[PDB]
Amino acid sequence: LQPFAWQVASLADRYEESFDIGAAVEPHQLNGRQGKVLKHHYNSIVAENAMKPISLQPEEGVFTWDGADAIVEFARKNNMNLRFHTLVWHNQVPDWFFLDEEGNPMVEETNEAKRQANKELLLERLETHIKTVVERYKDDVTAWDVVNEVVDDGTPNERGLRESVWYQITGDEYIRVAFETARKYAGEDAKLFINDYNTEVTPKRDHLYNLVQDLLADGVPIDGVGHQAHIQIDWPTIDEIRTSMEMFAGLGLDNQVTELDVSLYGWPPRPAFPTYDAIPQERFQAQADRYNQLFELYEELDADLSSVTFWGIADNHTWLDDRAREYNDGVGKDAPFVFDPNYRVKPAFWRIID
């Protein structure tokens, strides 16, 4: 049988000359077998969910720090780096941000002067959320996802910005405010990232590229691009990945791979294998070949890449299962990592440890 993750060489040790090796976690993953894998393999962590806006400030002025603090304390106790995910997102964000002083959605307002009053209110709220959160964690966090998923996959406006509530209310100003406020409160040395998925594919890659150039020219503080890397076995290509990271490096921006998982399924993900034991070993081999090429590329790009984080630990816990179930009538199992649901290594582990 394949040995347990804690019986093989550490990924963080393998890649110590190149970049951090990170995992997304929940508080319950900090102990038991998950915690043993974590301590063995990784030198960086990020909160899967506990640091999202709604997790930290679910009502106006009501902050809930318990889960986030557990993860911070774990990083401190275990000498791990710590990514903060995330100051600004259009998902997992409480609806109170976006209500006017009468308690109605700001997006519905048709009086332009009132829209401008709303924009200032929302930006002030965003400043207060960032200040409060940053002041708590500024000595612990080594990379901030200041904004998440602000760029569109299409082109609904000239700049290719996602038309979330943030954009409808503030245009791009929420993005500027977010970075400026993060810098102000976190300090001159804090590393500030814009994070997104599909950063390897156009038009998105280029909308992102233009946005970071625009903000940089305007003096907005941005240090790096977070590439979520929710990828497949055959897509995106190695060269697409390389080009994107080189493009951002050419601007003087750092790159981090922030939410890496290698799905077994394209889009749409059906038919999915219904259970883990139904997945044929050949699929794990195809995955291992992918992982091999990926990590060769990341090593090749290591002058321009400071951290590689997987969006989870082992195959027993991944949002990809939710995605699989969503497209296959409630049944389906994905397997995106190099450790199996029992914490045993997979073929992919051996192909990235060598």
Q: Give min distance, CB of 292 to Mg ion, in A.
A: 4
**Residue nearest to Na ion as judged by C-beta position:** 302
Q: What is the DSSP string of 225-278?
A: EEE--EE-SS-S-HHHHHHHHHHHHHTT-EEEEEEEEE-S--SS--SPPSSGGG
**Residue 193, SS3 per DSSP:** strand
Question: Is 259 in the active site?
Answer: yes
Q: Give min distance, CB of 19 to Na ion, in A.
A: 4
Cβ-based neighbour number of residue 317 at 10 Å: 18
Q: Give min distance, CB of 42 to Na ion, in A.
A: 16
Cβ contact 129:178 at 8 Å: no
Which residue's CB is nearer to Mg ion, number 85 or number 351?
351
Q: Does 129 contact Mg ion by CB under 5 A?
A: no
Q: Which does 157 bind (CB under 5 to 8 A by kind): Na ion, Mg ion, none?
A: none
Q: Which does 351 bind (CB under 5 to 8 A by kind): Na ion, Mg ion, none?
A: Mg ion
Q: Does 351 contact Mg ion by CB under 5 A?
A: yes
Q: Which does 176 bind (CB under 5 to 8 A by kind): Mg ion, Na ion, none?
A: none
CA distances (Å), 132 to each of 10, 50, 64, 126, 298, in order? 36, 15, 12, 10, 35
Single residue of 206, 214, 302, 326 touching Na ion by CB under 5 A: 302
Which of 272, 280, 248, 287 has its CA nearest to residue 333?
Answer: 272
Q: Is 305 annotated as a binding residue?
A: yes
Q: Which does 302 bind (CB under 5 to 8 A by kind): Na ion, Mg ion, none?
A: Na ion
Single residue of 128, 292, 293, 342 touching Mg ion by CB under 5 A: 292
Q: Is 244 annotated as a binding residue?
A: no
Q: Does 290 contact Mg ion by CB under 5 A?
A: no
With CB under 5 A, what is the number of residues at the site for Na ion?
3
Q: Which of 259, 296, 299, 326 is catalytic?
A: 259
Classify strands 20-25 and 143-148 as parallel, antiparallel or unpaired.
unpaired
Which of 122, 44, 105 has its CA nearest to residue 130?
Answer: 122
Q: Is 354 annotated as a binding residue?
A: yes
Cβ contact 28:59 at 8 Å: no
Q: Give min distance, CB of 191 to Na ion, in A.
A: 13
Q: Which two tokens stand for residue 108?
A: 């519905």
Cβ contact 81:43 at 8 Å: yes
Annotated active-site positions, please? 259
Residues that bind Na ion (CB under 5 A): 19, 302, 306
Contact footprint for Mg ion (CB under 5 A): 292, 351, 354
